[PDB]
Design a protein around this nucleic acid. Structure first.
Ligand SMILES: [Mg+2]
Ligand SMILES: [Mg+2]
Ligand SMILES: [Mg+2]
Lengths: 205, 175, 203, 97
RNA sequence: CGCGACCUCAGAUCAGACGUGGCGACCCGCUGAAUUUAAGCAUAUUAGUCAGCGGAGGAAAAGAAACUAACCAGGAUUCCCUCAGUAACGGCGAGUGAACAGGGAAGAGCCCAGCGCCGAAUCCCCGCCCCGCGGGGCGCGGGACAUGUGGCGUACGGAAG
RNA sequence: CGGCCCCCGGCGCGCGCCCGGGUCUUCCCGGAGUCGGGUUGCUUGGGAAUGCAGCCCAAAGCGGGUGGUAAACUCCAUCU
């Protein structure tokens, strides 16, 4: 069955696969079924923003992706605690809440508090009949538009710094080299062994 | 014994709880005078005997109960078995009465499995305190002995006779 | 107050008081029929932490289940196939015996809805479970909107579909790395999606 | 001079101090619950393996006692914890007398 | 000896409800091959598929972490694209074979037992009515349920006072 | 396009229901023949055992589970 210089191959067709076949013939039909499920969901709700609540700034895990910024799930009660809004009030203000999320850094904590107060300062509420607590006159003169598009406060905006130009000085052109990588990597794995021989000379008397 | 259970049910008789017939007119009699005088406190102490194992248990370990009548024939016996051991350590006196149906008639119900005395009348304290040493002699003070005493282990009369018929032969084997 | 003791007393069932009444009633259960209506739960703390209340419409059955693994139902142990499939006698039946117990309680009483069940005894051959049931058309159940979920017709025969906590322990579902053999819905819903040829329209 | 590999790894941030989440304080003893388990182990007693254990733990030896607790209670981290609280009953039985 | 209470149970063409059976494309729970492939054949493959049995619903199932991760950390479930024919399994042969990040579709969260508190503050049935259409009630009076625990406030994101 | 007939989702008179938040102080705080272990089956890509099940043994409470090589010691992370 094999021949001249070729590829040794494993087609996974040793199983009755013509019954379990999937053809995407309804796929234009479902694209105009979930546009009409977005349009008849936009006009059904309110002047409330389409594509739902405000999402947080979130950094990705796992070395490959930890230099980018992603839209997250909720707002991690500590960030709701500092911003001053209540946890059961917040999801009818338009603010997503994920109670199982942890804040253990401070800079990424203060980023989303700045984000959450910037949202509250660009929000207009409607009283049912015009009582308006925490709210004043005509609704920002009818709120300048109707409904937003694919993100209320532009959820990614992954930004990079300027770091314009520097002068190649001493102690910078001279030290932080490949020897610093090799010695720091070796002391990372010779740490527990060297702390064992130190015990052996501590029980030496 | 039935002379002590009769005095105990006499003492527990006039502490009978509220039923729903007399719950109607009491909510009149408080509020018809509240419509007419607005009393800041008309009644200082309505006393009652508590009922329910989940109610009595919280009273004993808080030492609010003063006498714990406990039933006899609870169908899952483990619903009750801790509570004589628990009344000893919290120092609250307990007493085993015959019949979970009989003290259930005090509470206008079918069975009630435990009652407890928390707030008795002051003028009738000398009837509650008269029977408590007559009770806590037999239950609290004997707990060092009543915890050793195993039960059961007696053969039937048709087989404990033929043990004795061998022994009466053995008493004739000697004399 | 009381129910914390009943829980903790039950959790030492090798001590001499507890292993007495766990076999004075295992004798008493074995003299009755295969399924049987209990007038009341034999351990009321365990019943109500599984969803029982003491009110009209709830009903307890103790039912009896014969212990052991399954023998393969084949005449004279001859399975007629490849030598890996001669398994007549060491076969273990991937659904639990408590799940069997809840199943033939909701099969006898096809009008009742089954909530869950619990363990009240085993001998050497028989194993005794109390299955707690719900009348979905009693007005104490069809009022009270904390109980109206089970009078809704998708909860019909929850153990013939394996949806209660006895039966779902054999489905193998759960979040985690130990359970991603069933990572969409169920085991055969994953298998259909790991083995469909998802040929697109432009490919 | 921050670097990725070595012994002080990672981009340097500053830690957020926070009172910990309430789910993590779950198996603490909570003195009323201590009262319920300590009251009920004298109305109920000891298991048959842990009466044989504490009659090896007073006379026989301890390496053979834990070898008996290794087999019945499952693991080694469970066998020592059982072996030390049988020894605290055996100490309270004898030395508190 | 009689009566009573309760507890275990019986009986009824008792007053009122319920369930059975069909269809079964899709869904859930079980059960389960062999042809075939390996140029023979046992493990393997076919395949956890066909046949078998039992339950549904217009969807079903799953679903708010006893999770992933190992770093500046993410955050229920389901579907799609990639991961990837990869890690891995395998007479290490024939063959088999996931997931986590990442980009999307959609997005919603909650309740209970327990532990305490509130005079069982709770529920069902019957009778006549407030007063009604197309009938269900909050009101009134009796029978039951229920302290072996109905209801309210409470749920691990803490809670109560 | 117009007119006809029936039907639906949503304003406004009468019922029904109605003290939330913050800060401090004290008290409270959880699911067992289950986890887990051994063994035997089936299953999985899961390999010194991924899952399930039978039988036996069977918990703890600064505990338990998980951290993809069996085990002991130790620290950390994470969930309940
Ligand atoms: Mg009944
Ligand atoms: Mg191509
Ligand atoms: Mg239908």
């Amino acid at each position: 069955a094999p021949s001249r210089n070729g590829m040794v191959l494993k087609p996974h067709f040793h199983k009755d696969w013509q019954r379990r076949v999937a053809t995407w013939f309804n796929q234009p039909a479902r694209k105009i079924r979930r546009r009409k499920a977005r349009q008849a969901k936009a006009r059904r709700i309110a002047p409330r923003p389409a594509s739902g609540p405000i999402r947080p700034i979130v950094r990705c895990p796992t070395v490959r992706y930890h230099t980018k910024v992603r839209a997250g799930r909720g707002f991690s009660l500590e960030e709701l605690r500092v911003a001053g809004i209540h946890k059961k009030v917040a999801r009818t203000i338009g603010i997503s809440v994920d109670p199982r999320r942890r804040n253990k850094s401070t800079e990424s904590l203060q980023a989303n508090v700045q984000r959450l107060k910037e949202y509250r300062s660009k929000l207009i509420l409607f009283p049912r009949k015009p009582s308006a607590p925490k709210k004043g006159d005509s609704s920002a003169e009818e709120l300048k538009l109707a409904t937003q598009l694919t993100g209320p406060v532009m959820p990614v905006r992954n930004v990079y710094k300027k770091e314009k130009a520097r002068v190649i000085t001493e102690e910078e052109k001279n030290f932080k080299a490949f020897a610093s990588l090799r010695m720091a990597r070796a002391n990372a794995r010779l740490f527990g062994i060297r702390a064992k021989r130190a015990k052996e000379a501590a029980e030496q008397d | 014994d039935r002379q002590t259970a009769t005095q105990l049910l006499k003492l527990a008789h006039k502490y009978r709880p509220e039923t729903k017939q007399e719950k109607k007119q009491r909510l009149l009699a408080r509020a018809e005078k509240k419509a007419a005088g607005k009393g800041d406190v008309p009644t200082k102490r309505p006393p009652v005997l508590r009922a329910g194992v989940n109610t009595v248990t919280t009273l004993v370990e808080n030492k609010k109960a003063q006498l714990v009548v406990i039933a006899h024939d609870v169908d899952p016996i483990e619903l009750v078995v801790f509570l004589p051991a628990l009344c000893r350590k919290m120092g609250v006196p307990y007493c085993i009465i015959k019949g979970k149906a009989r003290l259930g008639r005090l509470v206008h119900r079918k069975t009630c499995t435990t009652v407890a005395f928390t707030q008795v009348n002051s003028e009738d304290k000398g009837a509650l305190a008269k029977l408590v040493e007559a009770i806590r002699t037999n239950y609290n003070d004997r707990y060092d002995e009543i915890r050793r005493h195993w039960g059961g282990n007696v053969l039937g009369p048709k087989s404990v006779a033929r043990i004795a018929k061998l022994e009466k032969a053995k008493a004739k084997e000697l004399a | 107050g009381a129910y914390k003791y009943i829980q903790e007393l039950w959790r030492k069932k090798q001590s001499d008081v507890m292993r007495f009444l766990l076999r004075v009633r295992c004798w008493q259960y074995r003299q009755l029929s295969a399924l049987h209506r209990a007038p009341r739960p034999t351990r009321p703390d365990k019943a109500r932490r599984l969803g029982y209340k003491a009110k009209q419409g709830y009903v307890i059955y103790r039912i009896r289940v014969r212990r052991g693994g399954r023998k393969r139902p084949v005449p004279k142990g001859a399975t007629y196939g490849k030598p890996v499939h001669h398994g007549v006698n060491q076969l273990k039946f991937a659904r639990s015996l408590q799940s069997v117990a809840e199943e033939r309680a909701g099969r006898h009483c096809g009008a009742l809805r089954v909530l869950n069940s619990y363990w009240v005894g085993e001998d050497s051959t028989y194993k005794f479970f109390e299955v707690i049931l719900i009348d979905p058309f009693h007005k104490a159940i069809r009022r009270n909107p904390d109980t109206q979920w089970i009078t809704k017709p998708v909860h019909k025969h929850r153990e013939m579909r394996g949806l209660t906590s006895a039966g779902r322990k054999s489905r193998g579902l759960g979040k985690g790395h130990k359970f991603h053999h069933t990572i969409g819905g169920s085991r055969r819903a994953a298998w259909r999606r790991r083995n469909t040829l998802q040929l697109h329209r432009y490919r | 001079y921050p670097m990725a590999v070595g012994l002080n790894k990672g981009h340097k941030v500053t830690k957020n101090v926070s009172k910990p989440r309430h789910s993590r304080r779950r198996g603490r003893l909570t003195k009323h619950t201590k009262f319920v388990r300590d009251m009920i182990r004298e109305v109920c007693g000891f298991a048959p393996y842990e009466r044989r254990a504490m009659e090896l733990l007073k006379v026989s030896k301890d390496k053979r006692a834990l070898k008996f607790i290794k087999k019945r209670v499952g693991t080694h981290i469970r066998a020592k914890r059982k072996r030390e609280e049988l020894s605290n009953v055996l100490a309270a039985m004898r030395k508190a007398a």
